[PDB]
Structure 1
Amino acid sequence: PIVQNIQGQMVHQAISPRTLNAWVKVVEEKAFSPEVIPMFSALSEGATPQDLNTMLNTVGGHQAAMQMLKETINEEAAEWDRVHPVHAGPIAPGQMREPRGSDIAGTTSTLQEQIGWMTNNPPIPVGEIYKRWIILGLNKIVRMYSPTSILDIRQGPKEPFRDYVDRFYKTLRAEQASQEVKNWMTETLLVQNANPDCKTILKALGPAATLEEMMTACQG
């Protein structure tokens, strides 16, 4: 990943083994849960497409998820090539040729060319584009790992309200259908599926009730 110097300029730097070790360990230990996308975006800030291909190929196991991510990256690269055709002929001396989708992916280009793209004037953010594509692929992967659907949630007679709302919001963050649909769901489905006693305790507070009073009602 590129790093700025004392005078402000930046140059390529070898990827730290600690970053790769932490990424592989968090992938192994935390599997594919909603909290891998923020850590992935934090680990590889400013990473070249070669570094992202490293961080993806290094993930042993869960090869189906990695194949899904590869297919998503392939579709995004095809759409990018369709929306931005590259020109042919001689290239200007002060400009380097613009990358194609397969080259934005970093599959058929050298590291020096990535560094030249990233430190050009004006700079070309190939790393950020490929990171956005990988984040979309990881969103689709965490959507696939979702164990249950949002509608099938029903609290057991003994399962505490805390565990119920924990499971609910876990699969809700794993759903990621939309934002306003999520807002409507947390109003309706959250109170629609409570245990009868605590259910009517929550209905006593009306729809204006917030989550804090919703929990301290059934609390104790």
Structure 2
Amino acid sequence: PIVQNLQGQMVHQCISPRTLNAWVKVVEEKAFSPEVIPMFSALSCGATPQDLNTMLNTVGGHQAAMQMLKETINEEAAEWDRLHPVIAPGQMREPRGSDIAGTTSTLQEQIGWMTHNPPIPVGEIYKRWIILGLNKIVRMYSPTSILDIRQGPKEPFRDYVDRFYKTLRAEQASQEVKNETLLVQNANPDCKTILKALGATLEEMMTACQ
């Protein structure tokens, strides 16, 4: 990553083993559950594109997902190249899409762009792209539609809701589309009665159905 020495300067560090291991475990244990994204994002704090490639490369298995991911990166790099078409000796060049994915850039270039003032945050840009791709995967790997999350007849409301919102987190839509109407619909009769009786916070709905 790039991080700040107790002096003041911004310097390149290696990825820790702690971070490497953390990432592999995440992927091993949690597949492409949604909470992988924030965990990836956190574990890639400071990351150069090189570090992001390292991280993705250490993922074995899920190679369909990872090819899908490469496709999503191609799309976003091509779009970057549309919006910013691209040389002076000594000076620092503008990065193409493929420079951001760390394909055509060297580490030094990547550091140059990131630590320059103002920064070209190629790490953060590539990360944005990877996270796009990771969302598409998470939805892909999502087993069940939110429509098929119905409260079991002997299912405590809380459990149902847990499933509801877990499932909902996996899917991709405007948070307008994601914004407690299907929650009530899919509730079981006993609860739906109780919930329909109110005009309500989730806290209220969960108390009411407890």
TM-score range, shorter chain: over 0.9
Distance 1:120 1:94 in 2: 14
Distance 1:212 1:151 in 2: 22
Distance 1:100 1:190 in 2: 45
Matched, 1:60 2:51: no
Q: Which digits, 9 at most, give the CA deviation of each residue in 1:20-55, with x for residues without a partner?
A: 000000110111111011111111111111110000
Deviation of residue 169 (structure 1)? 0.6
Equivalent residues in 2 for 1:161-180, closer than 5 Å:
161-180=157-176
Distance 2:117 2:185 in 1: 57
Deviation of residue 82 (structure 1)? 1.9
Equivalent residues in 2 for 1:149-164, closer than 5 Å:
149-164=145-160
**Matched length:** 210
Deviation of residue 93 (structure 1)? 4.4
Q: Which digits, 9 at most, give the CA deviation of each residue in 1:136-195, with x for residues without a partner?
A: 111111111111112222222222222211111111111131111211xxx311111222
Q: Which digits, 9 at most, give the CA deviation of each residue in 1:44-72, with x for residues without a partner?
A: 11111111000001101111111111110
- Over the matched positions of the two proteins, sequence identity in percent amounts to 98
The ranges of structure 1 where at least 4 consecutive aligned residues each deviate by more than 6 angstroms after the TM superposition are none
1:7 counterpart SS class = coil
The answer to which of 76-85 and 64-73 deviates more is 76-85
1:46 counterpart SS class = coil
Distance 1:110 1:200, change over 3 A: same
Distance 1:60 1:14, change over 3 A: same
CA RMSD of aligned residues (A): 1.5
Normalising to structure 2: TM-score of the pair?
0.94
Question: Which segments of 5 or more consecutive residues in structure 2 lack a partner in the other structure?
Answer: none
Deviation of residue 113 (structure 1)? 1.7
1:3 counterpart SS class = strand
Question: Which segments of 5 or more consecutive residues in structure 1 lack a partner in the other structure?
Answer: none
Deviation of residue 196 (structure 1)? 1.6
Deviation of residue 94 (structure 1)? 5.6
2:146 counterpart SS class = coil
Deviation of residue 19 (structure 1)? 0.5
1:151 counterpart SS class = helix
Deviation of residue 83 (structure 1)? 1.9
